[PDB]
Design a protein around this ligand. Structure first.
Ligand SMILES: [K+]
Length: 205
């Protein structure tokens, strides 16, 4: 429970799924997958409503303070964002968000271990040790969920989003499970899960 305390309480906020290039969101340093918008100018975003939308519009072209919780670092931070209509893309922030809880979010990751040569994993470009699977086309909330998807994608392309500790960013991976492949399992990579196999929490010193 030794979790950073959230000003205004609770564990819900706005999960950043996507950040458009050169958006106000990108300039403020929002990272997809890991960041939850917790508050804006001190107003706690603990309800799925229009307060964020409305406070951005009110402050168009002006800077605004945001509190952000990261499921990567497990820390809160404050950042400045300037909502804008003048950058070419869609939205004042340029982000897609889903209102949900960040509680336990840092547990939902599957660490890529060794990757056997020429396996479905290698063909997809999964990288040993440095890659962590963190999402898919559907939500993945339980240890089993990655494997449920693998099992139902026998001989089918399965999209995964993967974080890499060398690049410190996430990328789309297409893998095709193949139980006939003639090395171990369906993937031909080991997968680590749980306390010792979460994202390293200090990408920067
Ligand atoms: K096999």
């Amino acid at each position: 429970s030794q979790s950073v305390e959230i000003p205004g309480g609770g564990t819900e906020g706005y999960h950043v799924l996507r950040v458009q290039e050169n958006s106000p969101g990108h300039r403020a340093g929002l990272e997809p997958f890991f960041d939850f918008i917790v508050s804006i100018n001190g107003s706690r975003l603990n309800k799925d409503n229009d307060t964020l939308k409305d406070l951005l519009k009110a402050n168009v072209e002006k800077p605004v303070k945001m509190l952000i919780y990261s499921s990567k670092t497990l820390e809160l931070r404050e950042t400045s964002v300037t909502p804008s209509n003048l950058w070419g893309g869609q939205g004042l922030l340029g982000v897609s968000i889903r209102f949900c809880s960040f509680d336990g979010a840092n547990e939902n990751v599957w660490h890529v271990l060794e990757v056997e040569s020429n396996s479905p994993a290698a063909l997809a470009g999964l990288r040993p040790h440095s890659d962590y699977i963190i999402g898919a086309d559907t939500v993945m909330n339980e240890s089993e969920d990655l494997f449920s998807l693998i099992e139902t994608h026998e001989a089918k392309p399965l999209k995964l989003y993967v974080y890499n500790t060398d690049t410190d960013n996430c990328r789309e991976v297409i893998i095709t499970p193949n139980s006939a492949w003639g090395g171990e399992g369906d993937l031909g990579c080991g997968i680590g899960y749980g306390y010792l196999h979460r994202i390293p929490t200090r990408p920067f010193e």
